[PDB]
Structures are given as structure tokens and as C-alpha cells.
Design a binder for this molecule. Structure first.
Ligand SMILES: *P(=O)(O)OCC(C)(C)[C@@H](O)C(=O)NCCC(=O)NCCSC(=O)c1ccccc1O
Length: 80
């Protein structure tokens, strides 16, 4: 399978570090932009997973800010 999808696990955990909350109290079905998530965090994300060959632009992440959709945006997104 895609072993790099584990990068999502570190993603999920990483927001928690900045959000100062537990990985249980995060809403991946709700919008993460409802939490303390600015664009520098967001632009960081692109670059951060891009190193594993993840391809996505900025706006799909904004359109559906949910890890549920972001995981799709990671693995396939839609090529480039
Ligand atoms: P961030 O706010 O700095 O956003 C960085 C982007 C928008 C990707 C850059 O293009 C940029 O040069 N900075 C513009 C900063 C600014 O004034 N804010 C615009 C945000 S538009 C948007 O869709 C968005 C993105 C992320 C968080 C909140 C938000 O409203």
C-alpha cells in the first residue's frame, strides 16, 4: 500500500503540537480552519508532504479543510 500515507499520522499529530490540544479533540471531519490554523501552517503542510511526492495546490485544502479530504489530496489528489 502507500506507506507514505503514514506521513498523515505525523501531520495529524503535528497540528496537535501547535493547537496544544489532544488528537482526540480535533475535528478532521470539521474544518481545521476553525482552529488555530493560519496560512503559514498551511503552506508548511504543502512543502512538508511534497517531499514524499504529494501533489496538491493550495486551494483544495482550503475548499475542504478536513484530514479526511486532505488524505485524498495527499495520495491521489489528481496527478498535478
Ligand atoms: P496567509 O494568510 O499568509 O496566506 C498565504 C497565501 C494566501 C497563500 C499567500 O498567497 C500570501 O502571499 N499571503 C497573503 C496573506 C493574507 O493577507 N491572507 C490571505 C488569506 S486567503 C485564504 O484563502 C486563507 C488561507 C489560509 C488561512 C486563512 C485564509 O483566509
Amino acid at each position: 500500500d502507500n506507506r507514505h500515507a503514514a506521513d498523515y499520522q505525523q501531520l495529524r499529530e503535528r497540528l496537535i503540537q501547535e493547537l496544544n490540544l489532544t488528537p482526540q479533540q480535533l475535528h478532521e471531519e470539521s474544518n481545521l480552519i476553525q482552529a488555530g490554523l493560519d496560512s503559514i501552517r498551511l503552506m508548511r503542510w504543502l512543502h512538508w508532504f511534497r517531499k514524499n511526492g504529494y501533489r496538491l495546490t493550495l486551494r483544495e485544502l482550503y475548499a475542504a479543510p478536513t484530514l479526511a479530504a486532505w488524505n485524498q489530496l495527499m495520495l491521489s489528489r489528481s496527478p498535478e
